[PDB]
Amino acid sequence: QQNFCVVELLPSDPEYNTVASKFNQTCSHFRIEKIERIQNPDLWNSYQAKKKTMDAKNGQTMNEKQLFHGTDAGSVPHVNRNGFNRSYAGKNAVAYGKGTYFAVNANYSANDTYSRPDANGRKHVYYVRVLTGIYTHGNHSLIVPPSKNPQNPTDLYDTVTDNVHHPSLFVAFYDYQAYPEYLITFRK
């Protein structure tokens, strides 16, 4: 279930200049070793279904952003199979899951705290399609999606950010809200 393939994106492939250019806006001091495309049909189809629903509701809003997420090597196969979906006890009592964080700029995700260097010094950051939708600033203490309207408090925001008009990060909460399209492997 949610089987996947991994294909190297070569420097000569159409999308390389764009993916590398975005990473290099803030990470040009690192050296890129490989960029790969993650091809997971079930995960892609489910993400696209969520995108279609959001596009049909949010008017002019550009619901998708491409953001970064650094992780340790041991999490890579999990992300490739499951994306950023989470399962745990009591998830189904409430309308959302535990937040998953993404950065606007690659250098944030390139921190060793996130993209932990592996045994060979290799660091791993995904360039992820994320349905940011309609967002507000995150709660300071209760890390859940806030209500949009005190008169309708089960209607929740799609994501939260640190700063509504100058974001540096986004937090996603819902299933199939993100697709791990590209994996960038790099070194100091």
Ligand X SMILES: Cc1nc2sc3c(c2c(=O)[nH]1)CCC3
177 contacts ligand X (rule: CB under 6 A):
no
Looking at 23, 114, 135, 176, which residue binds ligand X (CB under 6 A)? 114
Cβ proximity to ligand X: between 23 and 101 the closer is 101
| Smallest distance from ligand X to CB 68, Å | 6
Stretches 25-33, 41-49, 62-70, 84-92: which one binds ligand X (CB under 6 A)?
Answer: 62-70
7's enclosing H/E stretch is strand 5-8
Alpha helices in the chain (DSSP H): 16-27, 41-55, 76-82, 106-109
Looking at 103, 156, 172, 184, which residue binds ligand X (CB under 6 A)? 103
69 contacts ligand X (rule: CB under 6 A):
yes
Cβ proximity to ligand X: between 46 and 71 the closer is 71
Looking at 40, 46, 63, 71, which residue binds ligand X (CB under 6 A)? 71
| Token pair listed for 6 | 């991994």
Name the residue among 7, 71, 27 with its Cα closest to residue 187: 27
CA distances (Å), 155 to each of 37, 38, 57, 160, in order?
35, 33, 13, 14
CA distances (Å), 48 to each of 14, 77, 118, in order?
22, 21, 32
183 contacts ligand X (rule: CB under 6 A):
no
> Where does this chain bind ligand X (CB under 6 A)?
68-71, 101, 103, 108-109, 114, 169
